[PDB]
């Protein structure tokens, strides 16, 4: 189902594309897994612990 949903959009079914190094520039040797993930910010702040 995930692969079919990816095929519905203009995205590869494998879920990996080819990224370019921001600093240097050339293609990475192997495709990398990119996407959108839900990230949380825990209640452990460095300014509260320093």
């Amino acid at each position: 189902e995930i692969k079919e949903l990816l095929k519905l959009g203009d995205l590869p079914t494998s879920g990996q594309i080819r990224l370019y190094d921001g600093r240097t520039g050339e293609q990475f040797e192997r495709p990398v897994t990119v996407g959108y993930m839900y990230m949380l910010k825990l209640n452990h702040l460095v300014d509260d612990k320093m």
Binding site: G22, R23, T24, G25, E26
Partner: protein, 232 residues
Amino acid sequence: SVTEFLKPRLVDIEQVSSTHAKVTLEPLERGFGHTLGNALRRILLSSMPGCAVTEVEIDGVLHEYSTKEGVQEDILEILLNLKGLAVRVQGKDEVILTLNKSGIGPVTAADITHDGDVEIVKPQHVICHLTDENASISMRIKVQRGRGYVPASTRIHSEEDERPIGRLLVDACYSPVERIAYNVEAARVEQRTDLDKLVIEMETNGTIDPEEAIRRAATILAEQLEAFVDLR
């Protein structure tokens, strides 16, 4: 002929939309385009001058964490919306715009009283909503010109006069370029069959001309390269 190099030049500036644009440079020899392309991108992301909103002042506000009667959105939400406003200012580096609105409805960027030199690129951009007939909003917006991104904490470092209560400070993102995508393809020039052309796609806020941005990036690169050219 190996010693001499082909001179790249601008050949086409195809503007897809008011923000999206494409710039074509031709001809380029071997990998030079790459050595140019990324470099130009790595400049256009960080060292593009632009105008951004710094200080806001509302008549009925006292601090960033308050609310106004008759407005649907919070004061912090209003400041966040004003942060993304794109405005092109020419002739000076400091402008104090004023906005006055009343009645039920959205408050678009077209409600700002233009001063002639200052130009607004997104008149349909929404700032807040008034949900009361007897509700009036008056705002004073301070806009400046700079580079990069500076937060409020570093900008309030200058401590010479305490700001009056009710003068809200917002983060400034002076960079007007959001997306850069460069690619290099084969160029049909004479009979070399090896020269290449570089196409740069820029997605900006519409406040900077693509040709001016490219020329500025090239000038910055040449200025930085002058030191290496001298080399003590």
